[PDB]
mmCIF file of C-alpha atoms and ligand atoms in Angstrom:
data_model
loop_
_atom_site.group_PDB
_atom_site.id
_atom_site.type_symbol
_atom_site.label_atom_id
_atom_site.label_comp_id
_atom_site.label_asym_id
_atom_site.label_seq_id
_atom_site.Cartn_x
_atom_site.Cartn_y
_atom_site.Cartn_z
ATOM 1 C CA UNK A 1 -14.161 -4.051 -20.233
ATOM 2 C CA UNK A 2 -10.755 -2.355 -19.167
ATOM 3 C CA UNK A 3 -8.272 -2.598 -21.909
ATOM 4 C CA UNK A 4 -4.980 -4.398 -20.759
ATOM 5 C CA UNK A 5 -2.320 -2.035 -18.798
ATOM 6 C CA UNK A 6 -5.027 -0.127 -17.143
ATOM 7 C CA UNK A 7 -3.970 -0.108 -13.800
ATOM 8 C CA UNK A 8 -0.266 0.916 -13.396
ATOM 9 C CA UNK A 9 1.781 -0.105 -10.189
ATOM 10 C CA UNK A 10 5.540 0.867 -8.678
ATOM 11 C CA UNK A 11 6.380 0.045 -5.322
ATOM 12 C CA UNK A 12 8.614 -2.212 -3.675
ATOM 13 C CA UNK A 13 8.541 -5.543 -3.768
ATOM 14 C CA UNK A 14 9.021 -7.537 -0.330
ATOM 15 C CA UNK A 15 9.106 -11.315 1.139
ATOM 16 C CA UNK A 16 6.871 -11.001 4.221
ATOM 17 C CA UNK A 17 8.203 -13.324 7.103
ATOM 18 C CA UNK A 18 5.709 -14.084 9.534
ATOM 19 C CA UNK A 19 6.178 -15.149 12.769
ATOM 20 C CA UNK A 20 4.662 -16.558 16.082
ATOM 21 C CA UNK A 21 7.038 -14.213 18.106
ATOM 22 C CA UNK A 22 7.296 -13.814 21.633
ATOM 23 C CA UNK A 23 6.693 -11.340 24.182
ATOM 24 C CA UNK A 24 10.314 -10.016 24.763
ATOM 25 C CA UNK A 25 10.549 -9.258 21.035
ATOM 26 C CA UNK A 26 8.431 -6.129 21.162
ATOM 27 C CA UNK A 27 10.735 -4.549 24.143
ATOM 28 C CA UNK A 28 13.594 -5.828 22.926
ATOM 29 C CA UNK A 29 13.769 -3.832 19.550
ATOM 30 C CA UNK A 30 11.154 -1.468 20.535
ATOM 31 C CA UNK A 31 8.369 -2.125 18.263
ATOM 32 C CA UNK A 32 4.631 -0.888 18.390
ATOM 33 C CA UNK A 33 1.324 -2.501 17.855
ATOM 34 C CA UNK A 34 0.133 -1.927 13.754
ATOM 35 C CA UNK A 35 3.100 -0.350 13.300
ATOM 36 C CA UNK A 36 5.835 -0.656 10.792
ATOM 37 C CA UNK A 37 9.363 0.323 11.155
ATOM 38 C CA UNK A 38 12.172 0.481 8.638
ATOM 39 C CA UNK A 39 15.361 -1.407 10.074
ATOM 40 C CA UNK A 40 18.100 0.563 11.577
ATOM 41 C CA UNK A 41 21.171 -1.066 12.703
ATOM 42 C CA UNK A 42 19.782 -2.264 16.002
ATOM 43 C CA UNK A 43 17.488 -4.114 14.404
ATOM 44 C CA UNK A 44 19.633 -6.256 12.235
ATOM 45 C CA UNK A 45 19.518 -9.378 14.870
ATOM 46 C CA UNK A 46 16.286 -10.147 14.194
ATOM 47 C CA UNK A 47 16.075 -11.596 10.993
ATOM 48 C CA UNK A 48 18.647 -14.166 11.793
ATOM 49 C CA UNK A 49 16.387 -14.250 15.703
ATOM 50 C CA UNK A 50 13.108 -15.317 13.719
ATOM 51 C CA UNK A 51 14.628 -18.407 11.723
ATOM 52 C CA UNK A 52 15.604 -19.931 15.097
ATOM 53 C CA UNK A 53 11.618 -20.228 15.188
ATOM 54 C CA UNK A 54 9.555 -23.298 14.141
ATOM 55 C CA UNK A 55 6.503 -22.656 11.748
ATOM 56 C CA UNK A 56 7.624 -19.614 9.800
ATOM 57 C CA UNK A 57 5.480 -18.351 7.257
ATOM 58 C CA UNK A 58 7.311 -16.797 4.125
ATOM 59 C CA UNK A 59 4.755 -14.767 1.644
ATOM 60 C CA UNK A 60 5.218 -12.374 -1.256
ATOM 61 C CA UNK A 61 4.785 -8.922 0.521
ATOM 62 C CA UNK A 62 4.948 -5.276 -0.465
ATOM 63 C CA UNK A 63 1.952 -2.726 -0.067
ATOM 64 C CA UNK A 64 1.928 -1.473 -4.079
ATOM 65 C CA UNK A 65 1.943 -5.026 -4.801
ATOM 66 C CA UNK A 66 0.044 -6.431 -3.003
ATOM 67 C CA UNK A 67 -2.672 -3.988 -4.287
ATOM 68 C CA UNK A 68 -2.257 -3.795 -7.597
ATOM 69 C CA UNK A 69 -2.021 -7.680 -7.935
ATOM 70 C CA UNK A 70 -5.355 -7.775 -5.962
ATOM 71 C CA UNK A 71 -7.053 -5.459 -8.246
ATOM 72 C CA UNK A 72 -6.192 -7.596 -11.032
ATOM 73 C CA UNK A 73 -7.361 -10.635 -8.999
ATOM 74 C CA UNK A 74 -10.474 -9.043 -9.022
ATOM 75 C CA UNK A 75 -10.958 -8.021 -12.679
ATOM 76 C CA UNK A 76 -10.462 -11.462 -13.494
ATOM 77 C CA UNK A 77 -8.968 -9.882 -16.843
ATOM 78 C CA UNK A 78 -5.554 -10.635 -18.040
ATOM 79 C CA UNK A 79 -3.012 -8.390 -18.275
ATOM 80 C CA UNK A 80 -5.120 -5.201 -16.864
ATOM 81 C CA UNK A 81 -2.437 -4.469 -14.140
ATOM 82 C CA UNK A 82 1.005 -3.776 -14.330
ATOM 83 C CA UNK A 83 4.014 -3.426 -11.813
ATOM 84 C CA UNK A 84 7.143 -2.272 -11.071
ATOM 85 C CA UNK A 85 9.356 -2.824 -8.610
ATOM 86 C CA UNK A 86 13.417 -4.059 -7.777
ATOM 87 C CA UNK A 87 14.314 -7.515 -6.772
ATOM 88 C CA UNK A 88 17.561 -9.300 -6.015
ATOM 89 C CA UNK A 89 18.985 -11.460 -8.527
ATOM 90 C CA UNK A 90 17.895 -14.549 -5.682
ATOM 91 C CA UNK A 91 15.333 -16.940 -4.570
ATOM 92 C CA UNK A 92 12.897 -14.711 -3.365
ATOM 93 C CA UNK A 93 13.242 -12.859 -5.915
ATOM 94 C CA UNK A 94 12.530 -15.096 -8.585
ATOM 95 C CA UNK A 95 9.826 -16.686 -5.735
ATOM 96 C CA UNK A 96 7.808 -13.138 -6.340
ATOM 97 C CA UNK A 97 8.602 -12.550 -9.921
ATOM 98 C CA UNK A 98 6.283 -15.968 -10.466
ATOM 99 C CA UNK A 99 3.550 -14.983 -8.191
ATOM 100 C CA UNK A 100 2.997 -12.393 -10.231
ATOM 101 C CA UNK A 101 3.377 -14.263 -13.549
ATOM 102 C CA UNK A 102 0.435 -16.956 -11.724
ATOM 103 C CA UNK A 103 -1.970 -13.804 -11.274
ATOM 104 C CA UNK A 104 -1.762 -12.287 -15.096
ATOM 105 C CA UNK A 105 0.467 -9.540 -13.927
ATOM 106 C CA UNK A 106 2.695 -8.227 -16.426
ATOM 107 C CA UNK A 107 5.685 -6.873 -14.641
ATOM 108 C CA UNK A 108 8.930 -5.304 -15.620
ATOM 109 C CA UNK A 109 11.166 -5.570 -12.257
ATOM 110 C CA UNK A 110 14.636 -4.247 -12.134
ATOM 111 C CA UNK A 111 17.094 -6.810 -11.019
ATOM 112 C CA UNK A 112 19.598 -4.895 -8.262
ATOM 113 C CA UNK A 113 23.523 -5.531 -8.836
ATOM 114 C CA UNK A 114 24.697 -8.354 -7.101
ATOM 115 C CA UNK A 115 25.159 -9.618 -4.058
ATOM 116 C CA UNK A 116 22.016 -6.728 -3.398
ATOM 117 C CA UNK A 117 19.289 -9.168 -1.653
ATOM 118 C CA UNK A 118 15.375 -9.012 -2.349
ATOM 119 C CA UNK A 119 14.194 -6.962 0.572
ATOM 120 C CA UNK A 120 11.644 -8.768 3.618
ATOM 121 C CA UNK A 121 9.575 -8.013 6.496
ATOM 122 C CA UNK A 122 9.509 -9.176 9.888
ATOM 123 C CA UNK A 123 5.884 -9.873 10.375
ATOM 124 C CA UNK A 124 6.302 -10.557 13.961
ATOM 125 C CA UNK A 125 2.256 -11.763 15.103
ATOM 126 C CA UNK A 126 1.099 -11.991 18.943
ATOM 127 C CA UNK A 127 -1.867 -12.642 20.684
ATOM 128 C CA UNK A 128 -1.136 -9.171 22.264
ATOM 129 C CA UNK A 129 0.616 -7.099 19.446
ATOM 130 C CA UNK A 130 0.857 -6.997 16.035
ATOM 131 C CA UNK A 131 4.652 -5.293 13.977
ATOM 132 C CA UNK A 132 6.440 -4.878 11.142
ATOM 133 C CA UNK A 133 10.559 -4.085 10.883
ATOM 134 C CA UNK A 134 11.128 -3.788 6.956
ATOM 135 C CA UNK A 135 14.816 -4.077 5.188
ATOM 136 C CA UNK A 136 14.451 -2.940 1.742
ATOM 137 C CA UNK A 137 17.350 -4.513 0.416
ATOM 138 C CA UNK A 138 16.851 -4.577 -3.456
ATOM 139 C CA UNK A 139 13.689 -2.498 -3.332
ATOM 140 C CA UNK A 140 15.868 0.671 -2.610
ATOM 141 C CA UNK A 141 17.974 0.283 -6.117
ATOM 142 C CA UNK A 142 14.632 1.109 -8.306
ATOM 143 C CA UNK A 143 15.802 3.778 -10.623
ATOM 144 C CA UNK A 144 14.864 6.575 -12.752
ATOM 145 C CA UNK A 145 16.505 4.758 -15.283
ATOM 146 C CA UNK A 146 15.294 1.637 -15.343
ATOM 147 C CA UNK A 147 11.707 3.332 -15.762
ATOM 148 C CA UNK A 148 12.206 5.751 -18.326
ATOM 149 C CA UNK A 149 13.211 2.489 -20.237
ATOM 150 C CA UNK A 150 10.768 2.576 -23.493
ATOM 151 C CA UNK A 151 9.674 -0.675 -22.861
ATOM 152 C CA UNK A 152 8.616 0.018 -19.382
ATOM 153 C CA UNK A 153 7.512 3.758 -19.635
ATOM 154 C CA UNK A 154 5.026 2.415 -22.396
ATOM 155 C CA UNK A 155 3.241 0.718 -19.747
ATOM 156 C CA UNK A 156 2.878 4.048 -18.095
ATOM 157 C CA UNK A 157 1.604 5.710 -20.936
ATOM 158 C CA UNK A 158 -1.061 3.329 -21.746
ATOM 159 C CA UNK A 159 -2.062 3.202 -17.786
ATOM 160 C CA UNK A 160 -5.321 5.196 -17.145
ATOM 161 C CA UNK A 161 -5.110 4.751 -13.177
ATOM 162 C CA UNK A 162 -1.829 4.699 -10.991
ATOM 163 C CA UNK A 163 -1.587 3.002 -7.516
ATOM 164 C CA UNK A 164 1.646 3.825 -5.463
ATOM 165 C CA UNK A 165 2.071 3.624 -1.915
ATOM 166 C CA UNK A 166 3.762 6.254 0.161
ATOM 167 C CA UNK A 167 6.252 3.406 0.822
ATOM 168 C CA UNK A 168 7.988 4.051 -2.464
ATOM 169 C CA UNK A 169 9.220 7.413 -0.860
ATOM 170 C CA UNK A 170 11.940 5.728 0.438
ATOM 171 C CA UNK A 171 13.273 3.732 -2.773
ATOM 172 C CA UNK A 172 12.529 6.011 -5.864
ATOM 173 C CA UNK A 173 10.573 9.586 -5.547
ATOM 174 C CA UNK A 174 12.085 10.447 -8.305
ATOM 175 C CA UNK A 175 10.349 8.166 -9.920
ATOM 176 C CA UNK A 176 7.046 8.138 -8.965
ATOM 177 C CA UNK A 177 7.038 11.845 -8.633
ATOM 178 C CA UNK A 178 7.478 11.642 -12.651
ATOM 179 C CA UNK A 179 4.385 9.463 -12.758
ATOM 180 C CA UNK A 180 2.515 11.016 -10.961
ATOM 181 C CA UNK A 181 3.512 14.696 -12.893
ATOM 182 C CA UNK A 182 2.458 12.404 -15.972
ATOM 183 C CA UNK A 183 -1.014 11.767 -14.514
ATOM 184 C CA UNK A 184 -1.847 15.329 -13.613
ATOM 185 C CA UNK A 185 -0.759 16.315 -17.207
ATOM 186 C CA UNK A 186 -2.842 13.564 -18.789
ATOM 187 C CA UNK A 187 -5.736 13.914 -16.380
ATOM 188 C CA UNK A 188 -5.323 10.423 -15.383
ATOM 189 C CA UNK A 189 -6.821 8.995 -12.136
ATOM 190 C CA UNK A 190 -3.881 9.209 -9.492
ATOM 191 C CA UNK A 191 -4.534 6.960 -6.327
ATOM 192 C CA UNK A 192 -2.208 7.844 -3.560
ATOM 193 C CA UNK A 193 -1.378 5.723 -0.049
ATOM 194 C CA UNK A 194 0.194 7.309 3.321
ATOM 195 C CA UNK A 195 0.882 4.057 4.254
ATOM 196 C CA UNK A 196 2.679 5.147 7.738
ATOM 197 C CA UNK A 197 2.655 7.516 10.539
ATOM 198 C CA UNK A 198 6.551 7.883 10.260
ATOM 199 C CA UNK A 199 6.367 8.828 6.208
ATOM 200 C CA UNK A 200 3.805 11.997 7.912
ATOM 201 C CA UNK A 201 6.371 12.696 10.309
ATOM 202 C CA UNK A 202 9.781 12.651 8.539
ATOM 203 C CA UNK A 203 8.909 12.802 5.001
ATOM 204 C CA UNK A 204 6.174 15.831 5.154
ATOM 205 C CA UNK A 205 7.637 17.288 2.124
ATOM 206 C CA UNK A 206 7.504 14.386 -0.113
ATOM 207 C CA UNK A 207 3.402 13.470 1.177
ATOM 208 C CA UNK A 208 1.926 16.323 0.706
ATOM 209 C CA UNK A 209 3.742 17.298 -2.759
ATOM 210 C CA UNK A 210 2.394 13.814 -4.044
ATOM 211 C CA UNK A 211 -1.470 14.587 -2.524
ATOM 212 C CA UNK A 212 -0.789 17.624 -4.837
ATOM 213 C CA UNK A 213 -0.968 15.217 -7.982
ATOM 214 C CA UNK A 214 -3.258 12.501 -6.517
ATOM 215 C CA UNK A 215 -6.692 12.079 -7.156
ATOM 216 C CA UNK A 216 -7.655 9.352 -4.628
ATOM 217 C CA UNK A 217 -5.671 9.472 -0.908
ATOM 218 C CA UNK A 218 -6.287 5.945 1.094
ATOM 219 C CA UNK A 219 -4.953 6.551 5.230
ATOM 220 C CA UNK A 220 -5.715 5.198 8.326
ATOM 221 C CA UNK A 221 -6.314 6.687 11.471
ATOM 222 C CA UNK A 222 -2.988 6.357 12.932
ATOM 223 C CA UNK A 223 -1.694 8.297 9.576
ATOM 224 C CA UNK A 224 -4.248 10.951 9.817
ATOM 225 C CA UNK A 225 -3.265 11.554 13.360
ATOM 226 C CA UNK A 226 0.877 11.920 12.604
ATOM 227 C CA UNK A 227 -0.508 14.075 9.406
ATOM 228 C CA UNK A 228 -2.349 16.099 11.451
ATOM 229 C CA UNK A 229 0.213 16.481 14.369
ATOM 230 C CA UNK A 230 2.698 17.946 11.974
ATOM 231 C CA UNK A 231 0.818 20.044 9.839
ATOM 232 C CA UNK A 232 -0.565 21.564 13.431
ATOM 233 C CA UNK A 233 -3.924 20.023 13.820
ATOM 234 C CA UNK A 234 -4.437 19.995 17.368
ATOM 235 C CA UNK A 235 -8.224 19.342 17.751
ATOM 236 C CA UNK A 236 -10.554 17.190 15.379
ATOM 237 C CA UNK A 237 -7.326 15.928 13.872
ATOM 238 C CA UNK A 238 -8.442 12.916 12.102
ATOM 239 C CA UNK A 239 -11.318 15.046 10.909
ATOM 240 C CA UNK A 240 -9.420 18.103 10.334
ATOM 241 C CA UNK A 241 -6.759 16.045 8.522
ATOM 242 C CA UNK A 242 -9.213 14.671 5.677
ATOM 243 C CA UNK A 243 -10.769 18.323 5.575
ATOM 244 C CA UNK A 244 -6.994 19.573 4.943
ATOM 245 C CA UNK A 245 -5.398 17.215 2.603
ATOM 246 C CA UNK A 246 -9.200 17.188 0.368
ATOM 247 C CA UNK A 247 -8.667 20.751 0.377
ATOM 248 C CA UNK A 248 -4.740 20.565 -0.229
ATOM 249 C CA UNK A 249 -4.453 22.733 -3.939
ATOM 250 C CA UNK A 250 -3.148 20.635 -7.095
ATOM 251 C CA UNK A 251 0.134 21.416 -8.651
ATOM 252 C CA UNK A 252 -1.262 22.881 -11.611
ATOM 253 C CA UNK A 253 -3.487 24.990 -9.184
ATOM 254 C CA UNK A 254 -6.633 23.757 -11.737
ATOM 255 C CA UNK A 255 -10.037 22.898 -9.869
ATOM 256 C CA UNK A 256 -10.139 19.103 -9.447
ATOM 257 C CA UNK A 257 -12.030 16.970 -6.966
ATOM 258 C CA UNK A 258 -10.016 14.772 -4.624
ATOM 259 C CA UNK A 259 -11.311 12.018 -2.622
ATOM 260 C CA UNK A 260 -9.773 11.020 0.499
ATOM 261 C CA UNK A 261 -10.773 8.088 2.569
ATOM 262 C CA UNK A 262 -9.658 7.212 6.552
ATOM 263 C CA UNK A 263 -9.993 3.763 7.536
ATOM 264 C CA UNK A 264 -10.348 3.156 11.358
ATOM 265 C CA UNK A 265 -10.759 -0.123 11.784
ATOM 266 C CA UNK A 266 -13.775 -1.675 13.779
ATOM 267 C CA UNK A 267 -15.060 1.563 13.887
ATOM 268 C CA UNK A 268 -16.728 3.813 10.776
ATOM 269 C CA UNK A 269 -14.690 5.412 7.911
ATOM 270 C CA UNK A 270 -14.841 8.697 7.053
ATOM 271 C CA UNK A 271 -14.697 9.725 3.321
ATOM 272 C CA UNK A 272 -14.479 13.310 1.881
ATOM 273 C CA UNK A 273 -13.544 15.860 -1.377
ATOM 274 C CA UNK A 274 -12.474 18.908 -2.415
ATOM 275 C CA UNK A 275 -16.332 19.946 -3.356
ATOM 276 C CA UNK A 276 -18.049 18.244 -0.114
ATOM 277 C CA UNK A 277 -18.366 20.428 2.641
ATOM 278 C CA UNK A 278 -19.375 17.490 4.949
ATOM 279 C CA UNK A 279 -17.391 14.414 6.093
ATOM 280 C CA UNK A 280 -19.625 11.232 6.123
ATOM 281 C CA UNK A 281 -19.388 8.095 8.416
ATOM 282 C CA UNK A 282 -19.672 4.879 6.425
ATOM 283 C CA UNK A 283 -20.130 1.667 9.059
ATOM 284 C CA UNK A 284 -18.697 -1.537 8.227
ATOM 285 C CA UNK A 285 -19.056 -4.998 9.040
ATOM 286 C CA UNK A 286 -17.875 -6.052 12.256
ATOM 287 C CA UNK A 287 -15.992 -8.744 13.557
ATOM 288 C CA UNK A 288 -16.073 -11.642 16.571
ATOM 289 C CA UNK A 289 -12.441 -12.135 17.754
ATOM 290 C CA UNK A 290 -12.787 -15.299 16.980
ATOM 291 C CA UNK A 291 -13.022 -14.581 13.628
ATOM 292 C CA UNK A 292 -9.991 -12.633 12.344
ATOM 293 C CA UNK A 293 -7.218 -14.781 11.475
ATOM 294 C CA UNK A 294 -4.291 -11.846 10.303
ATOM 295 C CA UNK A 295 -5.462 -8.234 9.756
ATOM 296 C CA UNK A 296 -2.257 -7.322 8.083
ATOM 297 C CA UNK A 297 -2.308 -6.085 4.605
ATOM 298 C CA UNK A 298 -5.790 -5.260 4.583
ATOM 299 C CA UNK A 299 -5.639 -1.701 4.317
ATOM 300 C CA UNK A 300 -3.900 -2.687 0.891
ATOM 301 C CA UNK A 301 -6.724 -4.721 -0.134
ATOM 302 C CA UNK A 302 -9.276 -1.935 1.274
ATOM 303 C CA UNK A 303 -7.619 -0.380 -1.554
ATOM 304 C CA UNK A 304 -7.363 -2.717 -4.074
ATOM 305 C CA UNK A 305 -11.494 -3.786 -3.401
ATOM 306 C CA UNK A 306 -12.248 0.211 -3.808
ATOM 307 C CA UNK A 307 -9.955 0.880 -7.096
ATOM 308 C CA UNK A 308 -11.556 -2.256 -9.225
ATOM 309 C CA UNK A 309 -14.902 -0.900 -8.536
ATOM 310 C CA UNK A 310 -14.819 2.622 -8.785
ATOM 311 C CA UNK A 311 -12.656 2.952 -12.262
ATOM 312 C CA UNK A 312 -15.490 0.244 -13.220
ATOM 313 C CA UNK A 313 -17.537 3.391 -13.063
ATOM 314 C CA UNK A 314 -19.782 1.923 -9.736
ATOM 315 C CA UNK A 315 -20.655 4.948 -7.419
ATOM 316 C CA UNK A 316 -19.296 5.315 -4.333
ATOM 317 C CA UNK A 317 -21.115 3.555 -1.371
ATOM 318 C CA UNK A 318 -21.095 0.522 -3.908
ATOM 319 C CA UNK A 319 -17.048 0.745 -4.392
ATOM 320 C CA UNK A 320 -16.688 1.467 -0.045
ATOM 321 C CA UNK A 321 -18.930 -1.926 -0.062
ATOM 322 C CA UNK A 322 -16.273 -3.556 -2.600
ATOM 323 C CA UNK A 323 -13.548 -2.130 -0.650
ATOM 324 C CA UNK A 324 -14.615 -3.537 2.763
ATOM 325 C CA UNK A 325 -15.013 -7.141 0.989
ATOM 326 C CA UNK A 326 -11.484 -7.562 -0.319
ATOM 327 C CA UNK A 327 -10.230 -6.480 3.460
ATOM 328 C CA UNK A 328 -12.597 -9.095 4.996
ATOM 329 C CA UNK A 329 -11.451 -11.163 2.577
ATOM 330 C CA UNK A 330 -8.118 -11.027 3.469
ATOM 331 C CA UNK A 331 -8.458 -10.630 7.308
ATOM 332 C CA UNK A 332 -10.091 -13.703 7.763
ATOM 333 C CA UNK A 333 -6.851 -15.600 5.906
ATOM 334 C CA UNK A 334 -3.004 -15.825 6.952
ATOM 335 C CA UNK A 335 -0.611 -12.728 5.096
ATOM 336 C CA UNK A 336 -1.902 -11.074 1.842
ATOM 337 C CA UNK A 337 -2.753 -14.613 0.559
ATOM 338 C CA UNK A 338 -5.374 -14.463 -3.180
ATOM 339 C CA UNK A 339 -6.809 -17.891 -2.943
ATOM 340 C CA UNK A 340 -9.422 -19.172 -5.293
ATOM 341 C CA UNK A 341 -10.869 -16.597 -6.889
ATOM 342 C CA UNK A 342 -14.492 -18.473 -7.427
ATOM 343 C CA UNK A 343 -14.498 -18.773 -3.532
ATOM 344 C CA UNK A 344 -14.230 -14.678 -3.353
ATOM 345 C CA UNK A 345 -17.781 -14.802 -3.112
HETATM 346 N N1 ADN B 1 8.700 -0.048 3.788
HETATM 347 C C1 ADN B 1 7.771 -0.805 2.986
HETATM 348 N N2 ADN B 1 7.697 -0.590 1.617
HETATM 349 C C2 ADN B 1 6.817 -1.312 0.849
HETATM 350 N N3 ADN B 1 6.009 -2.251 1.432
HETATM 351 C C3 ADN B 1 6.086 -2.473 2.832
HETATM 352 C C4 ADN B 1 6.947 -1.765 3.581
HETATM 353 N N4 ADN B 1 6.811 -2.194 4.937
HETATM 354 C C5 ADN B 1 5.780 -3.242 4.981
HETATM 355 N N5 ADN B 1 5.332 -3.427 3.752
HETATM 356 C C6 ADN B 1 4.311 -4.401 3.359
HETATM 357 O O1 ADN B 1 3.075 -3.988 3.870
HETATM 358 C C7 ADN B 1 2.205 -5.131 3.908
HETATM 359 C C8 ADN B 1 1.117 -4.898 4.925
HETATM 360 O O2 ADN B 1 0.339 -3.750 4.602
HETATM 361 C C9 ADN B 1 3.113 -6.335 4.173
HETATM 362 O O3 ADN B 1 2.814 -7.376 3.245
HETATM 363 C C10 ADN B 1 4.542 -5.806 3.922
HETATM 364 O O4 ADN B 1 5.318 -6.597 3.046
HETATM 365 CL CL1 CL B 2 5.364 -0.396 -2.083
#
């Protein structure tokens, strides 16, 4: 029985572009497997490469979103979440702006200057790898300003939990940094993403000053292995790295409890706080490889699954239970696609 602008949401809204690519692709522009690049000017070529290719699948994307949309999928209640984010005054735009409107989502997105373009990813999908090479386009122009609007702050100040994705590091610290200040002053319920190895690496500053405010950390392995790299975790570092940033003091210096949770894919996650001395294992259900259709964006709905339980006041193991659901969910389906919602179950 949440009341409506609960759950609060700023990130960057994206048009995922997935493709059937081929083999050269990954040497080519030099991508990784599960990893996510932003592009750089060597990557340009390859959004105009991937519309040369037949079957193309065009989806609304972005990690905040694609959370906070699920989480109010899940609630099944109106007007609980909100979001917001920067389009383009396009399309896709406008494409994403109705998604949102279909799921009960009340948004207040910031329309970038033209000829500004809604940002995409390259979802390029293999048999043998699996990457991401994100222009932000639009996403980049979310302001301060257009925030500290009254009629979009007010959604802020009614929120009682906050989901933003490291992502949003790149478009608008400023603002989330405010938020997040805001939630820590309030004694909100702060839920924070690393969301990539490269924001570990060559935004250090900006991660750990935002674990300083946030309640709840999501990460993978690969992000708990960059954390720990840089912050000079040598042995144990996945380990060591939920020890550290569970231990990591709030801005205020007050004596909170933070949970932090490291997904690892097939194998257990480990979950941890401030006042547990102990990092537990918790297994989770496994998968034929025949089974899994698209595993991408389903750290985002690990999320989303967690956050609709656990601020539902269910304990723990319950909301990891929840959590693993909405990723299965979504694994076993094409992009971060929220089909019928009687058929969740
Ligand atoms: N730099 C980024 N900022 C916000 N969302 C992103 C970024 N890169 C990839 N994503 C989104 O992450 C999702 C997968 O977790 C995809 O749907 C994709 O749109
Ligand atoms: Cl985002």
């Amino acid at each position: 029985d949440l009341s409506e602008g609960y759950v609060f949401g700023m990130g960057n809204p994206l048009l995922d572009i997935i493709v059937d690519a081929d083999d050269f692709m990954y040497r080519k522009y030099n991508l990784k497997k599960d990893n996510i690049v932003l592009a750089e000017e060597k990557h340009m070529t390859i959004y105009d490469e991937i519309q040369k290719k037949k079957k193309l699948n065009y989806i609304a994307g972005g990690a905040t979103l694609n959370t906070v949309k699920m989480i109010q999928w899940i609630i099944q209640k109106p007007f609980v979440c909100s979001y917001v984010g920067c389009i383009g005054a396009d399309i896709q735009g406008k494409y994403i702006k109705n998604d949102c409107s279909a799921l009960d989502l009340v948004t207040e997105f910031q329309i970038a200057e033209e000829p500004l373009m809604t940002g995409k990813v390259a979802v390029l999908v293999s048999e043998k790898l699996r990457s991401m090479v994100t222009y932000l386009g639009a996403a980049c122009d979310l302001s301060l300003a257009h925030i500290e609007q009254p009629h979009v702050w007010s959604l802020v100040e009614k929120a009682q939990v906050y989901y933003i994705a490291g992502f949003v590091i790149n478009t608008c610290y400023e603002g989330m940094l405010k938020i997040a200040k805001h939630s820590l002053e309030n004694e909100k319920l702060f839920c924070f993403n690393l969301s990539a190895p490269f924001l570990s690496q060559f935004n250090t500053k900006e991660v750990d000053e935002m674990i300083s405010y946030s309640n709840i950390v999501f990460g993978n392995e690969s992000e708990a292995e960059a954390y720990g790299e840089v912050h000079g975790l040598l042995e144990d570092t996945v380990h060591a790295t939920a020890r550290y940033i569970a231990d990591l003091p709030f801005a205020d210096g007050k004596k909170r409890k933070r949970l932090v949770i490291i997904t690892r894919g097939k194998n257990p996650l480990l979950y941890t706080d401030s006042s547990d001395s102990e990092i537990h294992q918790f297994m989770v259900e496994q998968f034929k490889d025949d089974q899994i259709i698209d595993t991408n964006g389903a750290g985002d709905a690990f999320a989303a699954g967690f956050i609709a339980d656990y601020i539902r006041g269910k304990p723990m193991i319950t909301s990891l239970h929840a959590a693993v659901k909405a990723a299965a969910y979504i694994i076993c389906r094409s992009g971060f696609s929220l089909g019928s919602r009687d058929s969740y179950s």
